[PDB]
Design a protein around this ligand. Structure first.
Ligand SMILES: CCCCCCCCCCC(=O)OC[C@H](COP(=O)(O)OC[C@H](O)COP(=O)(O)OC[C@@H](COC(=O)CC)OC(=O)CCC)OC(=O)CCCCCCCC
Ligand SMILES: CCCCCCCCCCCCCCCC(=O)OC[C@H](COP(=O)([O-])OCC[N+](C)(C)C)OC(=O)CCCCCCCCCCCCCCC
Ligand code: HEC
Ligand code: HEC
Ligand code: HEC
Ligand code: HEC
Ligand code: HEC
Ligand code: HEC
Ligand SMILES: COc1c(O)c(C)c(C/C=C(\C)CC/C=C(\C)CC/C=C(/C)CC/C=C(\C)CC/C=C(\C)CCC=C(C)C)c(O)c1OC
Ligand SMILES: COc1c(O)c(C)c(C/C=C(\C)CC/C=C(\C)CC/C=C(\C)CC/C=C(\C)CC/C=C(/C)CCC=C(C)C)c(O)c1OC
Ligand SMILES: CCCCCCCCCCCCCCC(=O)O[C@H](COC(=O)CCCCCCCCCCCC)COP(=O)(O)O
Ligand SMILES: CCCCCCCCCCCCCCCCCC(=O)O[C@H](COC(=O)CCCCCC)COP(=O)(O)OCCN
Ligand SMILES: CCCCCCCCCCCCCCCCCC(=O)O[C@H](COC(=O)CCCCCC)COP(=O)(O)OCCN
Ligand SMILES: CCCCCCCCCCCCCC(=O)O[C@H](COC(=O)CCCCCCCCCCC)COP(=O)(O)O
Lengths: 385, 72, 54, 248, 385, 248
């Protein structure tokens, strides 16, 4: 046989990116996976070449970031690529998970793939939070303080857990040093989970935007989806180059260029832009413990998703009401982000509570009821009696 | 261009090129004094010589040197 | 086009043509874009200010 | 919050360095440094700007050297361990007027004057906010506002009550080039200078952005052509189906 | 089928550490691989939990190491495990490569496995050198200086390569910071190369100490070699616990507790104990460029090994002269280490040159000639004419 | 090198903390601190030893507090930014006698006295080397050695010529417990104290080593039993072979 098939190392390259049978009807929404892989490689390479100049002391963190942006040759390129690419990493990941919810890729036989995806999502949120605290600006310090006090809400144990996390009594030098070590560490766990994700994908192949089988008309990976992914790679690099070179500090928060001061609290403490729906979910609950439980349940309710989709056809392509309520859900998630960006004021508390309820009601009540009604409507539309 | 960016980001930064040169004063060092400084991460010996030390320097025969070299 | 396949037939001379094209393109594109970016900002650069200061 | 705690919205001034192609006005940066040194530098540090960054940007080599040699820095101690001073050089940083935080809070009625190395990048609005902050002091506060004594009013500061004094008056500095130095002229010059101090890469960032956007747009259109090319065997593929003989 | 066979993730765990067919005659020398895996996990876990307290500035490196050994709870356990476990990592790796040379595991069809092993060996030497320079003691600073000047020997390019490595003009703050970043990075590349190593092993299975096939009498991995590896794991932890808790600073060099001083050169600059044969090989050549080329050729001459072993039986088990000259080679390697630990004095220069020549002569002249003579001797011993 | 450049080999003194079970002599550490403070501390810093490490090791709580309050450290400045001092506390470090390196080289004829926090762990020989260094000065150097003026001889230093003076004489300090304070007694006490300063974990390190070696030896013997147990079906396995009927 061929050398790409008989060699031990090149057989994986073959069976994953050369001769992988892909369904020939998949559109550009089946390209966000390759795009996330490229953006992860961007994050790791800029992280290494920018962490060769970073000193993680609490008295030397912000000065070393400014040393990168001023004294290091092309260091502004590195930091701006790194932060804005983390923003694009979460945006492409949100689009990828929306592709997962829409076309029904979570359903059987792809439950393992969906669960490893949710694990990757949790690890990526953790990585972004740790790296945002490594800047040690104003928002970095106070966001670390608020999230660890949320961990202090745990009954009978929590204060000692938080003194363990801090490595002291408040967010201090051991906290920033261990956040830098963990933040260097967790992306390699993300890379291992990505390899496990690709294995759980490869044992059944991709889905298709129709929700029927794709075993009939398969076309290879090579040259077809290689050049289709190359198209979206160049578009992604174009938009990233715009938001790096022409308007770099748009997505960030301007308070992060104030150095970390434990005495001055800011006027409005807000995380970076993508953690705002989860921050709104947590802020909508009038309790600390129930708030933390609801914030983690807002990700575990993605795990309870394949067991509630009672639709007998895969994906929302050929269904009306499920497609409508899907876009209700997407614009609700955007409204959660925008509620979280605001203050704790009338009527944003009541709207945050209603928006959290519509989030959990979509994942727990709306999907099974609308899928059951859509099944019975498909049946009685064509069966006569 | 990407390889240039990620490799030239590891070269000598701006502030370590700023301290590449020292500008020691000729009028401030006395005659019979040696000055030892840390320049460019290295020690540098500085001496104001007398003309008799010049005459002693340029009149030693080259065969007494394993690497012969004139004073100028 | 025409019958010339001494550029496209053999992959050695083809990738050598692509590399020579990029080698010229780096220099020409950089010089042209620096000239345009300084022509668009006539009067604002330090060259013009240093020439203005007597 | 009301509009008073949030502060009034700074408007859209048409700077000479907005837009994706316009660079800084380096003569305005030179005049902004002059207004900085003669007004702000009594009370604002500039701790992150080295002297060498001004060489070739707003001043020549000898000008920066003869401005840095007016200041005293800490030398390495002598052969008896006594601490000694030295005149400045190109590799040092611009020194603040205050030796520590407590001297600043003592000399400014408790309020700490923030370091202005990143102040146009650490405020929302940015250039427009700094300009409207400087040129925004009313002659007298609106009727019904009880200021705490020792504080001043301008609506652009969040809360209304600021601890700065109105420090831009008509012709308090003289310009080297003979420009009429009104309040708005000096405020525009220092805001351009602080934009330089926060973003010294701005010129090279925009020209490398021009190169990168041109090359990636060309690559994106070329890749659209090659994708439409190599998929042409699959887009135009056709299927006919005559149903087979049912005896088998 | 069973769940350990039908699941996607557990099938790898099955086919590698549960139902892997091992030859039933392999002795305890086929246990150093599991021992190296355990010692790599030790190095990584202690590296993370000790790099949460490490600041990599040149003015704060040695003080942070002493902060670990004094102020951090159980930090002396972490540093002593880490340094002495790196010493045991190289000792078990030397024993593993000697198992490879002795029993002929380099021969066909296992050339890919041997080449990936040599790549792992080079990456591990690089990791140990970078981490030893991260201490920034006296030996750390001056060893970094000598090795990078050896990189300056390269003609027409080398000085700019060294100014690129240093990030300056001598071993300074950017050098130590990038050595810490690279030293955090390269062990994950070692983990990826270990996974590739296990793949290239698994496509043909282990050898056996007889040099014949083992396809006839295979016994599974599980419980048999699991508990045999558990025996040597507990012995390895026992000896590591001795050299950590009772005599920790034996293997190290006492000059490494002097802080890094660029002005004072030491009386004898010596690397840590295992790089001494390679340092002796390089010091034996009276030229800088030929010295660096000979030092890298002393590892690439392990790659030229399967093409010179002309013996028709696998392994040195049943051959007399090859076994004798193998132990000549092993004690020569020990003599290289002991020559390198000494000064540049009569007669250690002449003995270093002879010992380097016997090293390269074993890999290039002694093995093919002795294997040819042993083949002809096996033939004419039993064939009568 | 000759034996002169390498230095004479320090012999094997039988310390009270050698061996895998013996700990430090804490009374000897207390007396070693007294000899440190009254002899060495004029010229040797101890920069890495905090005051709190002596509490419960060689002194009580109030003794360390009343020894630390004799020294002055840098306080945070007052409400006018003036620098002020404060008496020491338990969280500070033991201060050196010299404010910087150049004062040390000025007061000691150019030679820099090394910091003694790790000096028994940064010399080959260790305890034996420090003890033989202190008690090794001859009354006069051997015949034919031209010392550079200002330097002293003892054979244990590498090169023979050391820039230290012989600073251990008979009964220059008085001990609190009434021990006869000869030169060798004081040298043994300071070498034990410097062993404590380099290795404060030494006691707990040896007892955790005892626990770990006991548990791992028991695990190793138990695992040998379980390996001989689960392989018993394979060690005793037997094979007989009657060769098959050749017609097939
Ligand atoms: C925000 C930062 C994200 C950074 C990620 C960068 C990549 C952005 C990805 C956006 C995306 O993937 O949307 C895909 C969406 C669905 O695609 P489809 O397969 O149904 O359409 C087949 C096409 O006609 C085939 O036509 P063809 O394949 O020959 O060329 C496609 C097109 C390439 O454009 C794109 O990839 C998306 C812009 O080439 C062009 O002609 C462009 C002309 C300038 O494309 C569409 O057709 C648009 C439908 C509405 C989507 C709106 C998205 C709002 C979120
Ligand atoms: C990572 C990004 C690195 C980008 C570096 C790009 C280097 C040049 C690549 C473009 C190139 O020169 O490709 C030419 C070859 C062949 O490309 P082709 O035209 O599809 O092959 C046909 C060969 N003919 C019949 C024309 C002789 O193509 C190749 O040899 C394939 C190279 C692919 C590199 C990825
Ligand atoms: C060293 C390896 C490294 C890796 C790998 C890495 N980063 Fe980072 N990251 C850093 C460093 C260093 C910083 C702090 C310096 C900075 O912010 O510019 C940082 C900062 C960040 C920030 C804050 C940026 C800012 O300035 O506000 C975000 C967000 C972030 N990382 C996200 C990610 C994500 C998402 C990934 C991968 C999934 C990732 N990082 C991988 C090194 C790394
Ligand atoms: C953070 C992850 C990390 C990993 C992974 C790691 N180390 Fe280290 N290592 C360190 C740190 C931090 C130091 C410096 C602190 C110290 O020496 O105690 C160090 C120091 C060392 C030292 C010098 C020890 C001394 O004190 O002299 C050696 C040798 C070493 N590492 C070898 C290795 C080897 C071999 C591996 C793996 C194959 C490895 N390290 C993996 C963090 C790591
Ligand atoms: C929470 C959901 C989820 C997250 C987050 C996620 N994935 Fe996926 N991924 C999927 C699903 C589901 C599929 C298959 C969907 C289908 O084919 O219908 C998939 C498919 C893929 C594919 C195959 C191509 C494709 O688009 O189907 C790649 C490659 C991939 N993922 C990589 C990644 C990478 C890299 C990350 C981030 C590190 C990631 N994924 C994060 C759920 C997820
Ligand atoms: C009278 C002393 C004084 C002088 C002179 C002075 N400042 Fe201020 N400035 C202050 C003080 C005090 C603050 C702090 C205000 C506060 O914290 O409420 C301040 C704050 C600022 C701020 C931040 C305001 C905010 O709300 O964040 C800016 C911007 C500023 N000054 C610009 C300037 C500029 C430009 C100059 C030079 C023209 C200047 N200042 C000269 C005292 C001064
Ligand atoms: C360059 C030589 C070499 C190096 C270095 C090397 N290996 Fe191996 N390894 C081998 C060879 C050869 C074998 C096959 C043994 C044989 O001949 O049957 C092997 C086999 C193994 C095995 C299977 C168990 C065994 O004993 O064979 C493991 C596990 C293994 N290696 C792990 C490692 C790990 C882990 C490292 C370092 C991280 C490593 N090896 C480094 C050559 C090497
Ligand atoms: C006379 C001033 C002086 C006094 C008093 C003094 N020292 Fe020293 N000591 C030095 C100098 C100078 C050196 C280093 C000289 C050199 O390097 O040649 C030194 C070096 C040492 C060294 C290491 C020498 C080496 O070669 O490594 C030790 C150990 C030492 N002193 C212990 C002590 C002890 C213990 C005391 C108090 C009991 C003490 N010293 C008191 C000046 C002094
Ligand atoms: C030929 O027969 C075989 C055989 O086939 C196999 C497979 C093996 C087995 C081989 C191995 C076990 C080697 C495997 C080694 C690896 C896969 C390397 C992986 C190493 C790692 C350390 C994985 C990385 C994991 C981490 C870095 C996680 C650590 C994270 C921490 C500690 C986070 C801490 C932070 C907090 C907040 C808790 C044999 O031993 C063997 O001979 C019998
Ligand atoms: C479903 O079909 C598939 C499919 O099967 C696959 C595999 C992919 C591809 C997906 C990926 C490749 C994502 C996987 C991503 C990873 C495994 C991340 C790997 C990245 C790293 C391990 C980090 C990179 C590390 C380096 C490059 C090391 C070198 C770095 C440095 C800094 C060394 C420099 C130092 C010096 C001294 C020069 C698809 O896109 C795809 O859809 C078409
Ligand atoms: C690990 C990182 C994952 C990133 C996801 C990237 C997905 C797309 C990868 C594109 C690879 C293109 C190879 C095609 C190929 O070799 O076809 C080869 C030849 O094709 C070409 O020469 C393509 C021209 C050169 C394109 C170079 C693109 C480089 C920019 C890559 C930017 C992203 C890294 C085989 O083509 P053929 O079988 O039709 O004959
Ligand atoms: C991040 C990776 C995580 C783990 C996933 C594993 C997938 C790895 C993908 C690597 C793809 C590129 C590898 C190409 C190597 C192919 C060369 C080859 O196989 O030739 C091999 C020899 O390989 C070597 O010597 C060096 C291999 C080192 C590879 C280090 C990258 C030829 O051997 P052959 O297959 O013909 O067997 C005949 C037996 N005598
Ligand atoms: C570079 C490679 C790095 C190493 C990766 C390869 C080695 C991975 C070894 C992993 C061993 C531990 C995995 C055992 C978990 C088995 C559970 C399982 O497979 O059930 C999966 C579901 O798994 C999940 O939901 C999340 C698993 C994430 C794993 C996170 C570690 C169900 O699988 P299945 O479809 O066969 O079940 C049908 C029901 N009868
Ligand atoms: C994560 C990998 C770590 C492997 C360490 C192996 C090196 C041997 C030295 C261990 C000394 C550190 C522990 C210690 O100081 O304990 C000391 C006791 O000694 C021991 O029990 C060590 C026995 C090791 C058994 C290994 C079991 C395998 C566990 C795998 C991980 C879940 C201190 O005990 P104590 O703090 O008083 O409770």
């Amino acid at each position: 046989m061929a050398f790409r098939k008989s060699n031990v190392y090149l057989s994986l390259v073959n069976s994953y990116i050369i001769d992988s049978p892909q369904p020939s009807s998949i559109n550009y929404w089946w390209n966000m996976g390759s795009l996330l892989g490229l953006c992860l490689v961007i994050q790791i390479v800029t992280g290494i070449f920018m962490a060769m100049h970073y000193s993680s002391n609490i008295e030397l963190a912000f000065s070393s970031v400014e040393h990168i942006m001023r004294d290091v040759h092309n260091g502004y390129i590195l930091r701006y690529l790194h932060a804005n690419g983390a923003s694009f990493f979460f945006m492409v990941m949100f689009m990828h998970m929306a592709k997962g919810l829409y076309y029904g890729s979570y359903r059987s036989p792809r439950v393992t793939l969906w669960n490893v995806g949710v694990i990757i999502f949790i690890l990526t949120i953790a990585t972004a939070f740790l790296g945002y605290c490594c800047v040690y600006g104003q928002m970095s310090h106070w966001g670390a303080t608020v999230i660890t006090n949320l961990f202090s809400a745990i009954p009978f144990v929590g204060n000692d857990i938080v003194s363990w996390l801090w490595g002291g009594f408040s967010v201090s030098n051991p906290t920033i040093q261990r956040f830098f070590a963990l933040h260097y560490l967790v992306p390699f766990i993300i890379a291992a989970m990505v390899i496990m994700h690709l294995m759980a994908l490869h044992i059944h192949g991709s889905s298709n935007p129709l929700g029927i089988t794709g075993n009939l008309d398969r076309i290879p990976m090579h040259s077809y989806f290689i050049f289709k992914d190359l198209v979206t790679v160049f578009l992604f690099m174009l938009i990233l180059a715009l938001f790096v070179f022409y308007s770099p500090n748009t997505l960030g928060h301007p308070d992060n260029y104030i150095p970390g001061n434990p005495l001055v609290t800011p006027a409005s403490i807000v995380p970076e832009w993508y953690l705002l729906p989860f921050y709104a979910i947590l802020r909508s609950i009038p309790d600390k413990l129930l708030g933390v439980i609801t914030m983690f349940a807002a990700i575990l309710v993605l795990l309870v998703l394949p067991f509630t989709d009672r639709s007998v056809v895969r994906g929302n392509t050929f269904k009306v009401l499920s497609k409508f309520f899907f876009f209700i859900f997407v614009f609700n998630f955007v409204l959660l982000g925008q509620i979280g960006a605001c203050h704790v004021e009338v009527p944003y508390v009541l709207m945050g509570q209603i928006a959290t309820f519509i989030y959990f009601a979509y994942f727990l009540i709306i999907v099974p009821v609308i899928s059951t009604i859509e099944n019975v409507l498909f049946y009685i539309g064509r069966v006569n009696k | 261009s990407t390889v240039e960016t990620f490799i030239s980001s590891m070269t000598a930064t701006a502030d370590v090129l700023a301290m590449a040169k020292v500008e020691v004063n000729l009028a401030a060092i006395p005659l019979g004094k040696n000055v030892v400084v840390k320049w460019q991460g290295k020690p540098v010996f500085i001496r104001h010589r007398t003309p008799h030390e010049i005459q002693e320097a340029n009149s030693v025969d080259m065969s007494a040197l394993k690497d012969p070299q004139t004073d100028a | 086009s025409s019958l010339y396949k001494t550029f496209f037939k053999r992959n050695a001379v083809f990738v050598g043509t692509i590399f020579a094209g990029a080698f010229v393109f780096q220099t020409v594109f950089d010089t042209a874009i620096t000239s345009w970016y300084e022509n668009h900002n006539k009067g604002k650069l330090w060259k013009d200010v240093k020439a203005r200061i007597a | 919050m009301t509009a008073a705690e949030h502060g009034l919205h700074a408007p859209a001034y048409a700077w000479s360095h907005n837009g994706p192609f316009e660079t800084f006005d380096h003569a305005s940066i030179r005049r902004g440094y002059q207004v900085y040194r003669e007004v702000c530098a009594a009370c604002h540090s500039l701790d992150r700007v080295a002297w060498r960054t001004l060489v070739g940007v707003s001043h020549t080599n000898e000008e920066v050297r003869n401005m840095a040699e007016e200041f005293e820095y800490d030398d390495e101690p002598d052969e008896q361990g006594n601490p000694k001073k030295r005149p400045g050089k190109l590799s040092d940083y611009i020194p603040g007027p205050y030796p520590n935080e407590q001297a600043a809070r003592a000399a400014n009625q408790g309020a700490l004057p923030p370091d202005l190395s990143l102040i146009v990048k650490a405020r929302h609005g940015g250039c427009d906010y700094i300009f409207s902050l400087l040129t925004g002091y009313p002659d007298e506060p609106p009727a019904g506002v009880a200021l705490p004594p020792g504080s001043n009013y301008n609506p652009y500061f969040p809360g209304g009550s600021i601890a700065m004094a109105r420090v831009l008056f008509d012709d308090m500095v003289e310009y080297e080039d003979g420009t009429p130095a009104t309040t708005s002229q000096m405020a525009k010059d220092v805001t351009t200078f602080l934009n330089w101090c926060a973003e010294p890469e701005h010129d090279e960032r925009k020209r490398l952005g021009l190169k990168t956007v041109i090359i990636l747009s060309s690559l994106y259109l070329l890749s659209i052509w090659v994708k439409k090319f190599k998929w042409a065997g699959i887009k135009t593929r056709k299927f006919v189906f005559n149903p087979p003989k049912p005896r088998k």
